[PDB]
Ligand binder design. Structure first.
Ligand SMILES: *[C@@H]1O[C@H](CO)[C@@H](O[C@@H]2O[C@H](CO)[C@@H](O[C@@H]3O[C@H](CO)[C@@H](O)[C@H](O)[C@@H]3O)[C@H](O)[C@H]2NC(C)=O)[C@H](O)[C@H]1NC(C)=O
Ligand SMILES: *[C@@H]1O[C@H](CO)[C@@H](O)[C@H](O)[C@H]1NC(C)=O
Ligand SMILES: *[C@@H]1O[C@H](CO)[C@@H](O)[C@H](O)[C@H]1NC(C)=O
Ligand SMILES: *[C@@H]1O[C@H](CO)[C@@H](O)[C@H](O)[C@H]1NC(C)=O
Ligand SMILES: *[C@@H]1O[C@H](CO)[C@@H](O)[C@H](O)[C@H]1NC(C)=O
Length: 1377
């Protein structure tokens, strides 16, 4: 009965058959569920269900009956099925099939509905007698993201099927059995089924907003009554309303959805009931008022993760983790409590801290490091104080001078290499001369003959003659001979003068092979380099025992730690830890290790892989119950307990050497439980045989006095291959992402490898690996666990590993730190302190719940509107517990909620009267008749959405006008999910920086140019607009491919995860594709793209003009603007539009404008980056679109573009603007008119702020401008605009009209070519005499009148009507066509 508004969203691809959708949703990533269901439908079991409802009904009985899902998992299935999560996954198959399969399968297809692909041969029959073709193109056997494999088999078989028909069932069974036997491995790919219709897909999981566009007024429903500004209590009274109700959850939803309407309805019926000013005892301890914060089992979630898709994926990952834990008899409540424990979080913070290695000469008896300094005895520093209090009493970024030993830097240098030598001579010495408070040492590198000799030479020269003489040889050699090889012509000259009085033990001269000097010194040096792995292609520098690889600007890194170490000393001083007679460098060396392993302590800190241990012994029970196992001792303690697994190729020396060390390590440590997995490179001979050889010797293991006893044990015995073992073996490696013939080590779930050489991992290396690992992962689990009194649940080394391995996996973020939020992955328990009686309410059983949600919502917030709606639907799930906290603010200067909100989402699917799946819509009932509203879509981050069907103005909605024009009080609008984003964050390799100005191309097998974009400075950001399918990213041919080669697109994560050295992107989700690509510079380049060492016209048009309109009037005026151009030029024109701000009425009309006026048009858009600062006010968004994304909004093929405002009219042939010389400037603008005489008062750009800032420069107009795009990108102007905007935008009153203000604020930095004023006319600021020579007219605002825009046009321009008539009759001609 009430006046309503209905909004629906539909995808850009047709709806896949429901059957296949349920298969995919059902078996998320468990393959067994997939094929176990694929059997069921190949019976013809699902043939008897006629309707989607019945079909859906059937799946529930099946899953429950076959043991696939429990209540918790079934409930999760329904929600994910509502969300239609599996539909893009299915469309991936189709797009792949349409674009790579069909054009590479030459011949005549008839009867080949289904067909296996074997050895590039197609078989249309199960009986497999005849093969139709040799398939053209690249291999289809590449395993890609949407693939599934069933069984292990040498041969690989693929079936492209249309499951829908009965023709499928026999084909399946042929290969299911073939895989069951073990002949080959089975996988299914899809074929678009023509039994189904081409109807588009109706989506859900988004939000709709109705924004009040007039907020100025403040002192069933007609209009909101504006109430006297007693805003301050809204949050507080609003919070009480709910608490009082006692059906609280529903109140908040009902209140929060229509909140603007209920503002004046609050403060009534002795309203405050402020018992809860009590709970700011809650505020006093933890969070600030009016802040929204969500936690999921301690995990603090960012806003972007708080959508239905983001949340479904989190539960899925979390339950897998918890279920693993609760097979050891822990309640969901106990499990979570252990995960978020204080001792656990402390450990993460603990090894976020730096680990140091002992850089001293002590082991090598002081004969390896050749220092250029001594700060306690150098008579340069003599002037300085040797006092501790010099350190402690410091502030700033300046280096404190001191005569003390406190900071050291040891840099290993190769004396053959010029660049290396140059470091010492220029780099190291300047620092000395400069009186820096750092001691500088260097140790030569000995990887070649010449290097060995030159270390000897320099070492000798130091020993007898001294530092200066040695220094001297080095300096002279660098300039003089310019090579590593020793030069006597250079050497002898040095001794000639520098050989005066070589003290102590005498010089021997001429030739060196001192038994001691060559042996001891060089081999001691080698022992130092080897010990700390300070050599290779990339050497390692040690500052205060902290490894810094010799790359990029390592001194920048050193300076960072130098200040960070100083602050570490200061704090010990204020606690009085320090004293005057102390060796300060040993404050750092307290916990330092003598030996450094790059595997255990990788210098890429992120590099860490942990596996779920319970999973490993559950999935591969067949394998792990038949591996040689050394049980850890009967009589050893819980603290001693640890579990180790060695994966090695026993057909290689390195593989068997590695195991000997592991066995040795086991003899010493009684607490460890060892497992041996034989992973061979060549699988011609069964892996089961060598495993069977050892399990017989299992009892006798580690009784190998010598290595050959192990070697011999491998050779002897006759065995029968357990081919069941072999199958589980190759499944394990596939699950664990391990290659064949690769060596790996696993202690308590953590993987290190591949081990190329067994010398890398020795007995001593296992000991530290256990020592370190023990500390972090095991000791925080043990304490925490015991604190809760769950320490009864640990029954052995394997029992313990399950827990420790699970809790290590809990703290690994999905999102790399520094991108979406800087904050680390630390699970807080800090809200448990909070009193709950009067602000909290809980939903779901805590006793049974596996999922625990903690929401802190401010009722007055607009963000809260979304949060409540989503959380209500996730609360409906069984096995989920939710607890809500309401926290309003007293600080309300402006109206808090200025919109109505509806979230389109259901917890379980809805069905038709005819049993089809119900589409979901946002229906607003009882909308005020007199309020002007704006329709907005609050869509998940990866989505790009535009209006498709609407007859109304969504920018200016009013029921009274629609009623008086259309006769209906009911509004319906349909949107289209046109694109889904592929977005990523780039980095250069190895010295990781964002490559800006790099150009990229997206491609498909059908077309080599889907899309193109350029790399941004901020986070090496880039994006593409695409739909489900298989794509590839190639650097654009030109300068980009000249300078770089991209090793990878980061599709597996930040990584590098092995197996990701790929450039293939696929999108099979509503979350799009997130990528972290890597690019390494080609041989010796410090080059830059941005600086140099008829195309666009042909592709597009003579003239390229772009614009935006945000109303029916402005779109009507835009039609006139385009026409005026056309009449005024005998040239070719192409028009460009900002797609999402335009009406469907306008969108449906243009082809008709294009046919009549003879122009070309193209729709463009870009999605506002997540890092870039948003605009809550739509008009401001629009302005941002014209200036912020100029370089990335238009294809690279476009040389230049021109912006013309919608209200404008042009009498000029527009080419002239193209030909206008810009004098090497990126863009050109026209200034403000000075010509009108008496207008001055309203000329605000002659005031203090604008005249002080614009010293001599003009105040420009954003109605018309030229962008020399090629130059724009070349100058990388965009990046500067974007970062200045982001920086300025922190202040809300910063840019009145950003579009005009940003180019004006940046004209110092970025040149603006100024235009002849023949180019702009405006009555308000230009004289009437001026318009004779006027080229174009903007209709700028009155403001000494109130005459409106429609009036100015008719009065100001007589030919405006002529243009309007032309459009008017055509629109009617179309309507009557
Ligand atoms: C992937 O799906 C399969 C099949 O649905 C899951 O396997 C099933 O796991 C259950 C345990 O949840 C097995 O039941 C029993 O487990 C106990 C464990 O102690 C064991 O002692 C019993 O003998 C029995 O196996 C069940 O047999 C097994 N298969 C089926 C058809 O139910 C598997 O857990 C799923 N994987 C993931 C990642 O969840
Ligand atoms: C209702 O509020 C008024 C004003 O604060 C107060 O005088 C009155 O006592 C309240 N009613 C009750 C039942 O306490
Ligand atoms: C929680 O309430 C109790 C009882 O009034 C009080 O003693 C305690 O301090 C409160 N906690 C906080 C942090 O306000
Ligand atoms: C304190 O002074 C003593 C005495 O000279 C010295 O041996 C030591 O380095 C200092 N610190 C401690 C912990 O004794
Ligand atoms: C278009 O072409 C005609 C014929 O050559 C010419 O007379 C006319 O002036 C041209 N239009 C304009 C405005 O340049």
């Amino acid at each position: 009965a009430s006046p309503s508004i209905n909004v629906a969203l539909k995808a850009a691809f047709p709806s896949p058959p429901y059957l296949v959708e349920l298969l995919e949703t059902a078996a998320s990533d468990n393959t067994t569920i997939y094929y176990s269901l694929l059997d069921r439908i190949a019976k013809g079991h699902f043939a008897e269900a006629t309707t989607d409802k019945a079909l859906y009904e059937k799946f529930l009985e099946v899953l429950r009956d076959d043991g696939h899902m429990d209540p918790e998992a079934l409930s999760a299935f329904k929600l994910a099925l509502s969300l239609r999560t599996a539909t893009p996954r299915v469309e991936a198959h189709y797009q792949y099939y349409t674009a790579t399969v069909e054009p590479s399968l030459s011949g005549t297809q008839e009867g080949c509905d289904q067909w296996f692909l074997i050895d590039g041969e197609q078989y249309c029959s199960p009986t497999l007698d005849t093969s139709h073709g040799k398939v053209k193109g690249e291999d289809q056997l590449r395993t890609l993201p949407f693939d599934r494999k069933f069984g292990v088999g040498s041969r690989d078989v693929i079936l492209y099927a249309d499951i829908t028909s009965k023709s499928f069932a026999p084909f399946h069974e042929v290969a299911m059995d073939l895989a069951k036997k073990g002949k080959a491995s089975y996988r299914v790919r899809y074929r678009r089924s023509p039994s189904h219709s081409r109807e588009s897909l109706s989506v859900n999981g988004y939000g709709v907003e109705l924004v009040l566009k007039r907020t100025d007024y403040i002192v069933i429903a007609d209009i909101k009554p504006l109430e006297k500004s007693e805003l301050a209590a809204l949050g507080m009274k609003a919070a009480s309303f709910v608490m009082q109700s006692e059906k609280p959850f529903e109140a908040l939803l009902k209140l929060t959805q229509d909140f603007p309407k209920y503002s004046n309805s609050l403060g009534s019926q002795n309203v405050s009931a402020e018992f809860e000013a009590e709970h700011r005892g809650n505020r006093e301890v933890f969070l600030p008022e009016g802040s929204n914060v969500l936690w999921l089992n301690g995990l603090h979630l960012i806003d972007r993760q708080i959508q239905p898709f983001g949340l479904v994926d989190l539960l899925t990952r979390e339950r897998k983790l918890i279920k693993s834990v609760l097979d050891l008899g822990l309640t969901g409540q106990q499990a979570v409590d252990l995960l978020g424990h204080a001792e656990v979080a402390h450990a993460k913070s603990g090894d976020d801290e730096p680990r140091r290695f002992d850089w001293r000469d002590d082991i090598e008896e002081g004969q390896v490091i050749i220092w250029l300094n001594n700060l306690e005895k150098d008579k340069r520093y003599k002037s300085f104080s040797p006092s501790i209090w010099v350190l402690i009493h410091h502030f700033g970024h300046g280096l404190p001078q001191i005569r003390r030993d406190v900071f050291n830097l040891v840099v290993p240098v190769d004396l053959t290499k010029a660049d290396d030598v140059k470091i010492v001579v220029e780099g190291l010495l300047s620092f000395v001369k400069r009186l820096i408070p750092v001691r500088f040492g260097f140790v030569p590198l000995t990887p070649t003959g010449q290097a060995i000799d030159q270390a000897k030479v320099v070492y000798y020269l130091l020993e007898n003659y001294g530092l200066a003489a040695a220094t001297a040889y080095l300096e002279k050699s660098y300039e003089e001979q310019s090579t590593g090889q020793p030069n006597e012509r250079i050497f002898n000259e040095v001794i000639k003068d520098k050989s005066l009085r070589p003290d102590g033990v005498e010089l021997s001269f001429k030739d060196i092979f001192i038994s001691e000097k060559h042996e001891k010194q060089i081999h001691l040096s080698k022992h130092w380099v080897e010990r700390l792995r300070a050599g290779g292609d990339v050497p390692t520098v040690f500052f205060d025992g902290f490894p810094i690889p010799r790359e990029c600007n390592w001194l920048r890194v050193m300076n960072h730690r130098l200040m960070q170490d100083l602050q570490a000393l200061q704090q010990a001083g204020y606690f009085g830890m320090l004293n005057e007679s102390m060796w300060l460098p040993g404050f750092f060396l307290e916990k330092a290790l003598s030996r450094r392993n790059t595997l255990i302590f990788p210098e890429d800190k992120n590099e860490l892989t942990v596996l779920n241990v319970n999973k490993i012994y559950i999935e591969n029970h067949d394998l792990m119950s038949k591996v040689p196992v050394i049980e850890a001792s009967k009589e050893s303690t819980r603290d001693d307990w640890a579990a180790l697994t060695v994966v090695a190729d026993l057909d290689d020396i390195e593989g068997q050497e590695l195991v000997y060390y592991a066995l040795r390590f086991r003899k010493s440590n009684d607490g460890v439980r060892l497992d041996i997995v034989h992973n061979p490179k060549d699988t011609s001979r069964s892996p089961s045989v060598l495993a069977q050889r050892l399990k017989s010797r299992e009892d006798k293991l580690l009784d190998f006095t010598r290595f050959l006893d192990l070697e011999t044990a491998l050779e002897t015995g006759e065995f029968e291959p357990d081919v069941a073992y072999d199958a589980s073996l190759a499944n394990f490696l596939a699950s664990s992402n391990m290659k064949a013939g690769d060596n790996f080590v696993i202690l308590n779930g953590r993987v290190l490898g591949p081990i190329t050489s067994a010398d890398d991992f020795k007995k001593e290396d296992f000991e530290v690996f256990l020592q370190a690992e023990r500390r972090t992962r095991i000791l925080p689990v043990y304490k925490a666990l015991e604190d809760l009194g769950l320490d009864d649940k640990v029954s052995g080394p394997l029992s313990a590993a399950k827990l420790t391995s699970v809790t290590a996996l809990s703290t690994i973020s999905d999102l790399p730190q520094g991108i979406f939020d800087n904050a680390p992955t630390v699970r807080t328990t800090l809200f448990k302190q909070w009193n709950s009686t009067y602000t909290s309410f809980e939903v779901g059983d805590a006793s049974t719940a596996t999922i625990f949600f903690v929401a802190v919502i401010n009722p007055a917030s607009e963000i809260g509107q979304r949060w409540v709606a989503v959380l209500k639907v996730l609360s409906e799930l069984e096995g989920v517990h939710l607890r809500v906290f309401l926290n309003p603010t007293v600080m309300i200067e402006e109206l808090p909620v200025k919109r109505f909100y509806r979230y389109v989402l259901s917890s379980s699917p809805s069905f038709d009267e005819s049993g089809k799946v119900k589409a979901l819509s946002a229906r607003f009932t009882g909308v005020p008749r007199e309020t002007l509203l704006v329709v907005g879509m609050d869509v998940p981050p990866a989505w790009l959405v535009t209006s498709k069907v609407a007859v109304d103005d969504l920018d200016n909605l009013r029921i009274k006008d629609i009623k008086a024009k259309r006769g209906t009080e009911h509004v319906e609008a349909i949107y289209e999910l046109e694109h889904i984003l592929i977005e990523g964050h780039s980095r250069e390799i190895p010295c990781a920086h964002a490559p800006r100005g790099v150009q990229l191309v997206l491609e498909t097998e059908n077309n080599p140019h889907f899309a193109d974009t350029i790399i941004m400075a901020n986070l090496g950001y880039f994006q593409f607009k695409a739909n489900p399918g298989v794509y590839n990213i190639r650097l654009k041919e030109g300068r980009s491919s000249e300078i770089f080669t991209l090793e990878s697109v980061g599709a597996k994560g930040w990584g590098p995860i092995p197996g990701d050295d790929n450039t293939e992107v696929v999108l099979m989700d509503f979350q799009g594709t997130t990528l972290y690509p890597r690019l390494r510079r080609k041989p010796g380049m410090e080059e830059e793209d941005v600086l140099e060492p008829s195309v666009s016209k042909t592709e597009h048009a003579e003239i390229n003009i772009f614009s935006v309109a945000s109303g029916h009037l402005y779109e009507r005026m835009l039609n006139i603007m385009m026409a005026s151009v056309m009449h005024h030029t005998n040239h070719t024109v192409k028009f460009w539009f900002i797609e999402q701000f335009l009406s469907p009425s306008f969108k449906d009309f243009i082809p008709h404008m294009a046919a009549e006026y003879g122009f070309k048009y193209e729709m463009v858009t870009y999605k506002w980056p997540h890092w870039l600062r948003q605009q809550k006010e739509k008009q401001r968004e629009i302005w941002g679109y014209k200036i912020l994304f100029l370089d990335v909004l238009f294809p690279l093929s476009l040389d230049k573009v021109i912006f013309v405002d919608a209200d404008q009219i042009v009498r000029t042939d527009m080419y002239d603007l193209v030909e206008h010389p810009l004098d090497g400037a990126p863009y050109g603008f026209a200034p403000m008119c000075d010509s009108r005489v008496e207008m001055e008062g309203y000329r605000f750009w002659k005031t203090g702020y604008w005249a002080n800032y614009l010293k001599g420069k003009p105040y420009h107009i954003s109605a018309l401008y030229v962008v020399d795009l090629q130059r724009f990108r070349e100058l990388a102007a965009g990046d500067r605009l974007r970062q200045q905007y982001h920086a300025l935008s922190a202040d809300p009153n910063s840019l009145a009209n950003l579009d005009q203000d940003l180019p004006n604020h940046m004209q110092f930095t970025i040149p603006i070519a100024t235009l002849p004023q023949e180019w702009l006319w405006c009555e308000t600021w230009c004289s009437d005499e001026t318009l004779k020579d006027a080229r174009t007219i903007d209709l700028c605002n009155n403001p000494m009148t109130k005459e409106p825009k429609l009036d100015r046009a008719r009065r100001q321009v007589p030919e405006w009507t002529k243009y309007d008539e032309e459009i008017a009759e055509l629109a009617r001609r179309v309507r009557e066509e």
